[PDB]
């Protein structure tokens, strides 16, 4: 069909961005880069709509036209540059630091973190490639590209300062793990089991802290600390609040309103 599309309609946009159906024919489109289109959120919305800092979409481009915002410790200014999972985003004018995390419903959330938390970044290890003239290399969930005793699915704690391997979270049963994709995004649990089937789509079984054994695909699994979260968890601890527990919260919110 001719060439690559460079537009994303509002109805086409993923549900997680939560862009209002009316008021806009089309949502912004991410750029090819560290994260994927449905695996990332736009930087313009994070400031313009989520934080409400920019009154118009254009006046979000103005804010980063002059350097003022950083992703993963790098200026990374482009307005629609993809900002995805475990990203160290910091507004130095606001003097605030936010990991981009997944909410229990599944939408992305900016959660404030300590400078020590800003010091390290979490990214999953994709399959090791053997290219670049035989030098072993492995890619991340953020596409960044080694230590020999490492496998795929494990999470490396890249510093973003050293830009090198630090604490490697090996993929084994019982590590406290996050779910990146599927219906139960944001939920945190130790991996009870794995059934490979020696074909494809290895099954994933996850015992949560409360004893509910949630499940997902093995690709969509993120390690979050070999032992302990080793990150600033948003205050939900992936407890999976139920629809009625969500109605309680909403009704008390209205009471406070």
């Amino acid at each position: 069909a001719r060439g690559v599309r460079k537009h994303l309609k509002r109805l086409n946009a993923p549900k997680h961005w939560l862009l209002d159906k009316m008021g806009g024919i089309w949502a912004p489109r991410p750029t090819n880069g560290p994260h994927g289109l449905r695996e990332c959120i736009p930087l313009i919305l994070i400031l313009r709509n989520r934080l409400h800092y920019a009154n118009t979409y254009a006046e979000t481009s103005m804010i980063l036209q002059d350097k003022n915002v950083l992703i993963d410790g790098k200026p990374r200014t482009d307005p629609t540059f993809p900002v995805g999972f475990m990203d160290v985003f910091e507004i130095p004018k606001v003097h605030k630091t936010f990991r981009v995390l997944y909410d229990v419903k599944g939408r992305f959330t900016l959660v404030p973190i300590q400078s020590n938390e800003a010091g390290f970044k979490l990214c999953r290890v994709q399959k090791i490639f053997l290219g670049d003239k035989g030098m072993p290399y492995l890619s991340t969930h953020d596409a960044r590209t080694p230590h020999p005793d490492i496998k795929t699915n494990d999470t490396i704690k890249i510093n973003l300062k050293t830009g090198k391997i630090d604490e490697w979270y090996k993929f084994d049963i019982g590590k406290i793990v996050m779910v990146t994709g599927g219906r139960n995004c944001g939920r945190i649990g130790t991996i009870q089991a794995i059934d490979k089937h020696m074909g494809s789509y290895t099954m994933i079984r996850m015992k949560d802290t409360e004893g509910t054994e949630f499940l997902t695909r093995l690709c969509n699994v993120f390690v979050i600390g070999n032992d302990s979260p080793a990150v600033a968890i948003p205050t939900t601890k992936g407890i999976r609040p139920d629809i009625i527990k969500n109605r309680e919260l909403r009704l008390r919110s209205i009471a406070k309103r």
Binding site: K21, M22, G23, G24, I25, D242, I243, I244, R247
Partner: protein
């Protein structure tokens, strides 16, 4: 293209399958006379919503008591009716919802709540007064006679702060 197409609309008024039934027709004239309704379309909107709410209770009936969906929907459906003041506050059961009649929807009318407050002492005068916006629901002047006041706002509904009774300025014949 044109998000005007994306905006939606719904049929809130249902005509009778049998159009001419003399007993039903006369009863509708009684309702129209007693509750000061403008046309039988007015009644149809109320009849439609009585039906759907009762149907929702019947859908909940085929669910087990305390089913996650049954409890969530059951709480909400009961809550809205007593929140508007339509259903008995204490009962809060599906069986009590099944007995609701359009008279309850008619009682929720702002123009209805005025004849009980003795402000216009006539549904037809209440309708007239609401048109001139001489009745205000708690700091909100209302030109529409079907405000559907929620139970708490019955205390709030009163003559408007704008010139009328205890006048801000000169109202009506005093003005003219």
């Amino acid at each position: 293209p044109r998000i005007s197409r994306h905006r939606n609309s719904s049929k809130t008024y249902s005509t009778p399958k049998k159009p001419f039934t003399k007993p039903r027709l006369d009863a509708e004239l009684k309702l129209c006379g007693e509750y000061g309704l403008k046309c039988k379309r007015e009644i149809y909107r109320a009849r439609y919503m009585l039906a759907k709410i009762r149907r929702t209770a019947r859908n909940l009936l085929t669910l087990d008591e305390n089913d996650i969906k049954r409890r969530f929907e059951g709480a909400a459906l009961l809550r809205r009716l007593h929140m508007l003041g339509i259903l008995d506050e204490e009962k809060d059961q599906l069986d009590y919802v099944l007995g609701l009649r359009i008279e309850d929807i008619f009682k929720r009318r702002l123009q209805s709540v005025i004849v009980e407050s003795k402000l216009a002492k006539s549904v037809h005068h209440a309708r007239n007064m609401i048109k001139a916006r001489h009745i205000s629901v708690g700091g909100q002047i209302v030109n529409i006679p079907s405000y559907m006041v929620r139970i708490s706002n019955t205390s709030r509904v009163a003559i408007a702060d704008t010139s009328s009774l205890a006048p801000n300025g000169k109202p009506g014949r005093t003005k003219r």
